[PDB]
Every structure is written in C-alpha cells, then in structure tokens.
Amino acid sequence: RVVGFIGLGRMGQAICRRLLASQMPVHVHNRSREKADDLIRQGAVWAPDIVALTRAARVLFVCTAGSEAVQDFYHAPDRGLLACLEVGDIVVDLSTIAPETAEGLHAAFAQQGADYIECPVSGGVEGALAGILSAIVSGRPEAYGLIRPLLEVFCATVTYVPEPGKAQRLKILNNLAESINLAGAIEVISQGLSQGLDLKSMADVFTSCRGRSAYMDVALGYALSGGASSNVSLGVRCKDLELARRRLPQDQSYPFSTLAMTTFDTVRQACGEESDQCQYFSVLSH
Amino acid sequence: VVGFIGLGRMGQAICRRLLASQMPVHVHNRSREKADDLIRQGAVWAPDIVALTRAARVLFVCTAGSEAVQDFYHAPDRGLLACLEVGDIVVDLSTIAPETAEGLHAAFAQQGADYIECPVSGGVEGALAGILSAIVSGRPEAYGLIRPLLEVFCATVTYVPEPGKAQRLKILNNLAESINLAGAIEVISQGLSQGLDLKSMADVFTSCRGRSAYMDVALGYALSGGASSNVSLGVRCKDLELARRRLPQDQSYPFSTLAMTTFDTVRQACGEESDQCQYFSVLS
Numbered sequence: 372r373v374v375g376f377i378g379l380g381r382m383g384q385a386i387c388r389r390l391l392a393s394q395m396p397v398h399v400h401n402r403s404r405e406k407a408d409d410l411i412r413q414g415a416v417w418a419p420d421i422v423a424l425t426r427a428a429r430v431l432f433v434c435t436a437g438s439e440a441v442q443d444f445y446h447a448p449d450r451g452l453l454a455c456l457e458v459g460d461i462v463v464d465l466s467t468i469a470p471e472t473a474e475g476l477h478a479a480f481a482q483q484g485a486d487y488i489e490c491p492v493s494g495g496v497e498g499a500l501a502g503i504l505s506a507i508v509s510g511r512p513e514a515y516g517l518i519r520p521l522l523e524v525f526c527a528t529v530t531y532v533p534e535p536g537k538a539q540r541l542k543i544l545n546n547l548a549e550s551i552n553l554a555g556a557i558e559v560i561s562q563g564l565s566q567g568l569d570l571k572s573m574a575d576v577f578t579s580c581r582g583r584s585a586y587m588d589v590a591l592g593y594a595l596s597g598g599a600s601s602n603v604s605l606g607v608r609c610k611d612l613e614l615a616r617r618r619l620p621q622d623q624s625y626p627f628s629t630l631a632m633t634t635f636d637t638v639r640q641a642c643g644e645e646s647d648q649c650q651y652f653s654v655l656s657h
Numbered sequence: 658v659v660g661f662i663g664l665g666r667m668g669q670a671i672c673r674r675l676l677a678s679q680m681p682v683h684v685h686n687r688s689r690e691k692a693d694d695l696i697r698q699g700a701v702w703a704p705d706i707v708a709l710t711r712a713a714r715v716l717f718v719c720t721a722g723s724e725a726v727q728d729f730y731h732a733p734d735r736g737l738l739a740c741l742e743v744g745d746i747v748v749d750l751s752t753i754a755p756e757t758a759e760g761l762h763a764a765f766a767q768q769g770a771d772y773i774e775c776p777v778s779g780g781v782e783g784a785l786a787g788i789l790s791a792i793v794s795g796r797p798e799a800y801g802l803i804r805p806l807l808e809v810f811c812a813t814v815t816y817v818p819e820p821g822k823a824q825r826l827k828i829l830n831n832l833a834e835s836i837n838l839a840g841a842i843e844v845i846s847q848g849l850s851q852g853l854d855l856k857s858m859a860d861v862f863t864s865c866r867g868r869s870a871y872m873d874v875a876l877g878y879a880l881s882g883g884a885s886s887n888v889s890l891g892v893r894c895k896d897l898e899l900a901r902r903r904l905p906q907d908q909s910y911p912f913s914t915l916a917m918t919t920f921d922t923v924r925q926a927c928g929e930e931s932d933q934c935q936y937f938s939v940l941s
C-alpha cells in the first residue's frame with residue numbers, strides 16, 4: 372500500500388527513513404527537493420507536486436513547520452491538498468500547529484468526504500529513527516483505526532483523544548514543559564561546570580537522581596558530544612512557545628512558562644532560526 | 658548492627674527497608690514517638706547518641722537543616738564527634754552545604770573515623786522500594802565497607818571521592834527538580850484551565866518528552882487529590898537556599914533564581930511542613 376509524505380525536514384526525513392525501513396512504498400514531496408535525495412537513493416519515489424502525490428497515495432503524512440506551510444499545502448487553489456483529495460482519503464498531519472487550525476482542517480476535510488488525522492508526535496529525530504515516537508491523535512475513529520497500523524511502524528505510544536484540536540492542545544503543553552526543563556537543565560549543567568564539576572559526574576547524577584528528565588538527557592547529550600545537533604531548531608522551538616503564549620490566560624500569571632517563551636525568543640534572536648535549541652548554553656555564558 | 662539517627666519522612670522509609678532485610682537497626686530521634694512504628698517492625702530504641710555508638714560501628718544520619726548538624730555532631734561530650742571510636746563510619750544521607758560536609762570529613766578523620774557523605778534521591782517511594790540513587794564522597798576503604806549496606810536500599814550509587822562533591826551534585830540535581838516541578842505544575846494548571854482532563858495529560862506528559870521525574874510527582878499529587886509527596890516546603894527551600902548561596906556574582910541564571918523565589922513564596926504562604934506541590938494552590 373503506497374503512502375505519501377510531505378515535508379522532508381529533520382523529523383519528516385527521519386520518519387520517512389523508518390517507513391522505508393519497514394519496506395513501505397513511500398512517495399515523497401518537499402518544497403526543497405534536495406532533501407529527498409537520500410530518501411530517493413534508499414527507495415522513496417519523488418513526487419514533484421501534490422497532484423502527483425495524491426494520484427499515487429490514498430494516505431498521506433504531513434510534517435512541516437509553520438502556518439505558511441499549512442496555508443500553502445492545504446489551501447492553494449487547484450494545486451493544494453483539499454483540491455486533490457478523493458472521498459475516503461486520509462491525511463495524517465504530524466506537525467505541531469494551532470488547535471484552531473487543526474479544528475478547521477478537521478471540518479474542511481469532512482466536507483470533502485475525507486479524513487484529517489491530527490497526529491502531533493514527540494521523541495525527536497532519535498525516536499523517529501528507532502520507531503519509538505509517542506503520538507497524540509485526534510480525529511474520527513474509523514480513519515484512526517485504518518492508519519493506526521501505519522503509526523505502529525514509527526511509534527511506541529499512541530494516545531487517542533478524539534476531539535478535534537485536543538491533540539495539539541496536549542502537544543503544545545507538553546512542549547512548554549520541555550522548554551522549561553531544557554532551560555533549567557542547561558542552567559544547572561552550566562553552573563556545575565563553573566563550580567568545577569566534571570560532565571561525567573553530572574551526567575551520572577542527573578540521569579539517576581530525580582532531577583532527571585527527557586530534556587535533561589537532551590542537554591547532557593549536547594554537552595557531552597561537544598554540540599552535536601539535537602535536531603530541534605530554535606525556529607521550531609519558538610514556534611511552539613508562541614503557540615503556547617497565545618493560549619496564556621489574562622487572569623493568571625505563569626512565570627516559568629512566560630520565562631521560557633522570552634528566553635528562547637532571545638536565544639533565537641542571538642543565534643538564528645536554524646541554530647540548535649541548546650544554544651542557550653552559549654547565550655548563558657554570553 | 659547498624660545505628661540510624663533521624664526518623665523523619667526519609668529516615669523512616671530507609672529504616673523500614675533496612676529492617677525488611679533483617680538487618681539489626683538501632684534508632685534514635687529527637688521526637689521519640691516517631692520511633693514507635695519502626696520498633697513495631699523490629700528496630701531497637703537508643704535513648705542516646707552514646708547508647709547508639711555503644712551498639713553500632715556504622716551509623717546512618719538523615720536529618721534536615723544546619724541546626725541538626727550542630728546539635729548531633731558538635732554537642733560537647735554527647736555528640737557524634739565525641740562518641741566516635743577509631744574505625745567507626747557515619748553515613749550522612751542528609752543534604753547539607755558542601756563546605757559543611759568538607760569540615761565533617763576533616764573532623765572525622767582527626768578522630769580516626771570516617772565521614773561518608775551520601776546524599777540520596779528517589780523520595781520515600783524509592784527508599785521503600787530500595788531503589789534510591791546515592792551520591793557518595795569520602796575515602797575508598799570506608800566506602801567499600803558501607804557499599805553493601807547502601808545496596809539494601811539503593812539501585813544506583815555514584816562514587817565521587819572528593820569531599821563536598823556529592824553535595825554539590827545533589828544540590829544542583831535538586832535545582833533541576835525544583836524547576837521541573839514548578840514547570841510541571843504550571844503546565845498541568847493551564848491544561849485544567851483549558852478543559853483538558855487529568856487522565857489525558859497524564860498519558861501525554863509521561864510518554865512524550867516533557868516527561869520528568871518531578872512531572873510524575875506533580876501528576877501523582879493531582880491524580881491523588883493531594884496525597885503527600887513526602888517532601889516539605891521546608892526541605893525544598895533548604896536545598897534551594899544551598900543553591901542560591903552558590904550562585905556567582907557575574908552571571909544570571911533566571912530559571913534557577915525564579916525557582917528559589919517561587920518556592921520561597923509558596924513556603925511563606927503555605928507553611929514549612931506543607932507539601933512542595935502546594936505551588937498548585939498558589940496558582941489557583
């Protein structure tokens with residue numbers, strides 16, 4: 372069964388590699404075609420546009436960053452997804468997007484007799500390549516049941532929360548906690564270095580004692596490797612912080628949340644959109 | 658025979674695990690009634706540091722605050738330093754200032770005894786399951802002598818010989834705990850205000866990469882309707898204050914400083930012995 376895939380960024384490429392590794396036939400499309408080259412070498416089929424992709428595939432994955440990509444891929448007249456879908460098609464959107472955007476796409480797909488599956492993921496490039504991503508899934512149960520065995524190829528945990536927009540709500544809150552944990556872990560590692568502590572002992576303690584977190588692991592991996600990419604850009608991190616910022620209530624202060632939004636915005640301004648989320652390390656020391 | 662001093666939340670749990678292994682344990686505590694349930698489990702009451710040292714060549718200590726360091730170690734004639742025999746070992750499970758641990762290492766060595774600086778992590782839950790993590794500083798011969806004892810209630814033991822080093826690592830680890838905890842509570846509270854159910858947030862915040870040991874703490878508090886996490890605001894701020902005193906003058910650490918001020922505010926509003934998770938109520 373042929374599956375399509377749009378968005379060959381860091382996460383998209385990694386999920387595609389996992390699908391190819393299970394011997395799924397995969398047709399791939401990206402705005403920047405050079406990011407398909409390695410996938411093509413490994414058996415993927417290039418689709419130059421959404422028309423060609425939808426001809427071949429009745430189930431498609433989307434893994435892009437930003438609201439402009441939502442607009443271009445879904446709503447471009449004649450050329451976009453909504454114009455090319457057939458009745459019974461399913462799109463599994465793995466992007467992190469605003470819940471109201473996801474809700475609107477659920478409704479637009481239903482009008483066409485197709486199904487939007489809202490499927491944000493967590494686990495990074497590393498989890499994609501090992502096939503152990505966590506998915507949060509909103510959408511209708513029959514379409515979910517049909518694509519569920521596909522998610523199994525690259526996911527370990529899948530949380531089905533049917534209400535449209537609910538998966539994105541949970542993902543954005545998950546990533547706010549990532550951002551707080553990451554900034555704290557970088558501060559704690561940095562202080563330890565200034566205090567004379569060796570990275571090996573800090574890694575030993577911060578993975579075994581209860582300061583441990585998934586993103587402490589990220590920060591330690593970054594420090595231990597001398598800056599090997601965590602494969603999350605500040606552009607992607609700040610996109611999610613901005614989604615969270617727009618959901619902050621006017622009646623209660625959340626200082627750690629608001630600090631995380633401002634902190635990574637400043638690091639983005641100082642280091643550039645494509646630089647690593649962990650570049651807070653270098654900003655911290657100035 | 659093992660002695661144990663300090664039967665607070667963590668001490669009682671470690672003692673329970675020691676006793677479950679059928680080790681002889683003699684216990685002492687300032688507040689006598691905290692021993693009764695340990696004695697029901699086979700512990701032997703020691704009225705005295707003197708009585709404790711007469712029975713045991715290896716003593717555990719598990720107290721909170723610098724006043725307890727002064728009262729138990731430096732009491733003239735009656736304190737630990739006066740009662741120690743050559744060859745004795747005191748295994749201190751408390752979180753204290755690194756310079757305090759350094760002084761005790763030296764004071765013990767000059768009594769011909771050994772101070773083993775052994776802060777732990779895992780909470781009461783981890784102690785009862787015997788899977789605490791330990792960070793250990795001190796001399797290798799004494800460390801080797803007490804390592805099999807640690808194995809009764811620990812799963813991981815990180816040996817960093819340099820005196821003061823285990824406490825430096827503990828304090829930093831607990832700074833990360835405090836930041837993670839505050840963040841977890843903010844995220845859960847916002848989720849509730851946005852109409853997400855706790856069950857969904859628990860499924861996601863444990864499987865996705867916002868997960869952490871203290872997110873699990875915050876979730877268990879909310880799912881249980883406020884059952885104790887067995888860490889008081891007094892203990893949490895004790896460790897934050899030890900971190901504050903180690904901040905440099907020339908560099909800002911905003912999340913670290915926010916954690917210190919936030920939990921101070923919670924402590925002041927909710928009381929020394931209230932749960933560290935009372936940040937939930939300050940946010941309500």
Ligand SMILES: NC(=O)c1ccc[n+]([C@@H]2O[C@H](COP(=O)([O-])OP(=O)(O)OC[C@H]3O[C@@H](n4cnc5c(N)ncnc54)[C@H](OP(=O)(O)O)[C@@H]3O)[C@@H](O)[C@H]2O)c1
Binds near residue numbers: 401437493
């Ligand atoms: N990185 C992670 O570890 C991770 C983990 C969980 C979730 N995510 C989510 O996965 C998605 C992708 O993240 P990434 O890290 O892969 O981002 P990325 O590496 O920056 O790739 C971004 C993708 O979006 C496409 N895109 C952006 N603007 C576009 C436009 N105007 N028109 C067409 N295509 C456009 C890019 O196309 P070009 O290649 O032509 O620029 C690229 O395919 C995001 O929603 C992110 O939140 C990432």
Ligand SMILES: NC(=O)c1ccc[n+]([C@@H]2O[C@H](COP(=O)([O-])OP(=O)(O)OC[C@H]3O[C@@H](n4cnc5c(N)ncnc54)[C@H](OP(=O)(O)O)[C@@H]3O)[C@@H](O)[C@H]2O)c1
Binds near residue numbers: 668691
């Ligand atoms: N999850 C945890 O609770 C946890 C995990 C890791 C590390 N720790 C560390 O473990 C140690 C104990 O924590 P806890 O949570 O068990 O605190 P706790 O429940 O408050 O017990 C504190 C202990 O200190 C004793 N104490 C305090 N001041 C004293 C004094 N002046 N003279 C004599 N005894 C004194 C108390 O005696 P009374 O019983 O007479 O008050 C009690 O036994 C702390 O250093 C803490 O940082 C705690």
Ligand SMILES: CC(=O)CP(=O)(O)O
Binds near residue numbers: 493603611
């Ligand atoms: C930014 C992002 O979603 C990365 P994650 O896999 O959740 O760590």
Ligand SMILES: CC(=O)CP(=O)(O)O
Binds near residue numbers: 777779780781888893
């Ligand atoms: C406060 C404290 O040290 C508790 P922990 O076991 O590290 O969570």
